[PDB]
Amino acid sequence: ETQSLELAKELISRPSVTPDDRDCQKLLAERLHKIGFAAEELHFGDTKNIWLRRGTKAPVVCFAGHTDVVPTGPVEKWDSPPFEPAERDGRLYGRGAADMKTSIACFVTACERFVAKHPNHQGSIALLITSDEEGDALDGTTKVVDVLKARDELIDYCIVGEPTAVDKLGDMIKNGRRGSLSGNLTVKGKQGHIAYPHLAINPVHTFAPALLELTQEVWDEGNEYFPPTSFQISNINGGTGATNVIPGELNVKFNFRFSTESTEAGLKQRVHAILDKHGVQYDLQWSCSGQPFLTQAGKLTDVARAAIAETCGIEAELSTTGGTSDGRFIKAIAQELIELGPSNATIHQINENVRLNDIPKLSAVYEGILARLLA
Amino acid sequence: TETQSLELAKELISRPSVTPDDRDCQKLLAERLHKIGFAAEELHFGDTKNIWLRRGTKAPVVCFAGHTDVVPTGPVEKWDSPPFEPAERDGRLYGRGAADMKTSIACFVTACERFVAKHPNHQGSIALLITSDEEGDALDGTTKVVDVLKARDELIDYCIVGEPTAVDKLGDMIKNGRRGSLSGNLTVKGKQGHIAYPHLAINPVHTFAPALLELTQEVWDEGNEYFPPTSFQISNINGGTGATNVIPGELNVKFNFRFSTESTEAGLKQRVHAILDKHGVQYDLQWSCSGQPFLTQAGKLTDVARAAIAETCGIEAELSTTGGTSDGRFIKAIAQELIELGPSNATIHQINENVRLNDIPKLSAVYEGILARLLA
Ligand SMILES: [Zn+2]
Ligand SMILES: [Zn+2]
Ligand SMILES: [Zn+2]
Ligand SMILES: [Zn+2]
Ligand SMILES: [Zn+2]
Numbered sequence: 068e069t070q071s072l073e074l075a076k077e078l079i080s081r082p083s084v085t086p087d088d089r090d091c092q093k094l095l096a097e098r099l100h101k102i103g104f105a106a107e108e109l110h111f112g113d114t115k116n117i118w119l120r121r122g123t124k125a126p127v128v129c130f131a132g133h134t135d136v137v138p139t140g141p142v143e144k145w146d147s148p149p150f151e152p153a154e155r156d157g158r159l160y161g162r163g164a165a166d167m168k169t170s171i172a173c174f175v176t177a178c179e180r181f182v183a184k185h186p187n188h189q190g191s192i193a194l195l196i197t198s199d200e201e202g203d204a205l206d207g208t209t210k211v212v213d214v215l216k217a218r219d220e221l222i223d224y225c226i227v228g229e230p231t232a233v234d235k236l237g238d239m240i241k242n243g244r245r246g247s248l249s250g251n252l253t254v255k256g257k258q259g260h261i262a263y264p265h266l267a268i269n270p271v272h273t274f275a276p277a278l279l280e281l282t283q284e285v286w287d288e289g290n291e292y293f294p295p296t297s298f299q300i301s302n303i304n305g306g307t308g309a310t311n312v313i314p315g316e317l318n319v320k321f322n323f324r325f326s327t328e329s330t331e332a333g334l335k336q337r338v339h340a341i342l343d344k345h346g347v348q349y350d351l352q353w354s355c356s357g358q359p360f361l362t363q364a365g366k367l368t369d370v371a372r373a374a375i376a377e378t379c380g381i382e383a384e385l386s387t388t389g390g391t392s393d394g395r396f397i398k399a400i401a402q403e404l405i406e407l408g409p410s411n412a413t414i415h416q417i418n419e420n421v422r423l424n425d426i427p428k429l430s431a432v433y434e435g436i437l438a439r440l441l442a
Numbered sequence: 443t444e445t446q447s448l449e450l451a452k453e454l455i456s457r458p459s460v461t462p463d464d465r466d467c468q469k470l471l472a473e474r475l476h477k478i479g480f481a482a483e484e485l486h487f488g489d490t491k492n493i494w495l496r497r498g499t500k501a502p503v504v505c506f507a508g509h510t511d512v513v514p515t516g517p518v519e520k521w522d523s524p525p526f527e528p529a530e531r532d533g534r535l536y537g538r539g540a541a542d543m544k545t546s547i548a549c550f551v552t553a554c555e556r557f558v559a560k561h562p563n564h565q566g567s568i569a570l571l572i573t574s575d576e577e578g579d580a581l582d583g584t585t586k587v588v589d590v591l592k593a594r595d596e597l598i599d600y601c602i603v604g605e606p607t608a609v610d611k612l613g614d615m616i617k618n619g620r621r622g623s624l625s626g627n628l629t630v631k632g633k634q635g636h637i638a639y640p641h642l643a644i645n646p647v648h649t650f651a652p653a654l655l656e657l658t659q660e661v662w663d664e665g666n667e668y669f670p671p672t673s674f675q676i677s678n679i680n681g682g683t684g685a686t687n688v689i690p691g692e693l694n695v696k697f698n699f700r701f702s703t704e705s706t707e708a709g710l711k712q713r714v715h716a717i718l719d720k721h722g723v724q725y726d727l728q729w730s731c732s733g734q735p736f737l738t739q740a741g742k743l744t745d746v747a748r749a750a751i752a753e754t755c756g757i758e759a760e761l762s763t764t765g766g767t768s769d770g771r772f773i774k775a776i777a778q779e780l781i782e783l784g785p786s787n788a789t790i791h792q793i794n795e796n797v798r799l800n801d802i803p804k805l806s807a808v809y810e811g812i813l814a815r816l817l818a
Pocket of ligand 4: 543576606
């Protein structure tokens, strides 16, 4: 089949930089209407969202994704234009080729094939599609999930089509993701000429014992699904530039990518306790961009593995590593949720691409998941 | 009580000798002291004027050292009286160079005149070593004069550097030495990457952490009766460009030692490298050393200066090595014993720079007392 490729190219050619959908959701609704998918627009702010649903009864199998793509940067740095999808060297190049329009196209064609085979299949098939997953994402999937929860329209199995493969399609699926908690610390000292240290307080020096403690701390020990919670400093700056001045303050930016084994509250409490135990005097701003989520190994992960083994001939590893996805919202309404897509090697980069041969394989995988959950 | 010191101070202050311009101060000094047997040698090095004035041919040689340059005044409207129109007001003499250090130079000239008058066949020799660039780059000042004196084996037994040393009352402190300064520019190497993949990055903040702590906690030496412990301080630390989801690739750290004679440049470097290397830090380190510590232990010169201050000022002087440095760091190489002694340093390089009027004849009587205890 070449329908998946054709659809992917059609989507890629629409310059849907966040939050502009460029009529991608209209295209998808109108294509799926033929096969009984009802369309419901759920627009909020400047974001377009759509809930497409075939069927009325459980089990409900949902594909979730996003039509928006990240900015291209200057087109002249690309080998071919980012919204003029190109085949070259066994790859399809364009912004959104990996993240994540090829997945969308592959699921749509999987539904078409599946429903042609099984027009009386049990349950429901839905798509949950946003035009802002790559930006602030405050008027996107999160708001759709709230709508669905409030009306008791829950999901049994959800596949988020983000790119998850490492090197071969199907080598990796995500069954959860870390959350993210960030701190902006400003340690206070007292500026002065360096040769008169008794008139100054060096915030580098006051911070040092806490810095070491922080970087050596074991926050948790991870578990079967998650690595240990990870603390990293991104930025540190203190001084005026003069080499004969003791700084008056020191700024430190840090982040946690945390598992289910730690909480936002507990991490913050422990950081303050380490600072306070060393007598550090400080200001601290905290922000949290998302919460961890997890699906235990079970039916969904087993079905996905089986479909991958049939199509791709490889064992799919479960993982929670990397960044996050809109699964962080959807898990609240989904009994089981995974992420499954092509290689993420080129996401958000110039000359983003997917291997051509992986395109019909990914569609086949999705169709195999549908057949196992609904046929 | 003599009024000559104050009048000479005013004469000097009135000359706007912003570095390196002498404005004839050294001509004035040479001409005046020629009357009492000081021979003059001018040592012009580039843009800088220097003089070696000397009376006598034998040891002991007592030298006063100083500088006729002054720092800039800044906007002149910000002064309560014009910086080169010395003024007497509220018990103080105001003007640029009143404290740093034209009063000292005046007071030593008039001490020479009074001392020589009372002791016309004193032993030894008296000298002045004066530069027009102590405040600027000073590449052509005292250090080059010292090199000429050392090359010709014209050495000094006792030197008084007339920089202001009083903290409050004239005579409260004498400097008998200074710290040296050793600076490092440390670049800690890591490997940039997205923060969510730390195993693919190397975070230089994290690799440096244990070494940072050890460096900041280190006791480099115990001090001694003349110096505080060697002092290590981090002046700057910078890594990253503001992205909160990126592990930076390198970290810049600048630090400094103000170190005594209890530690050496090489020894401090070695210990720093050893601490970095024990913790497995990967780095580049560029060193700079702007000067070396120097010291005159308590002995004749410090004794005489304390005796003179007790007699003139009624103050029990203490010895110090604190603060920055002076041209003594150069002169000590040719002077067996060297101190710094002058009036209050409270106002140096500031607007409305001044000295107490009553301190002026006192300082000159102290200098004369030193001459008499060393040479009579
Ligand atoms: Zn995506
Ligand atoms: Zn993305
Ligand atoms: Zn000065
Ligand atoms: Zn000076
Ligand atoms: Zn006498």
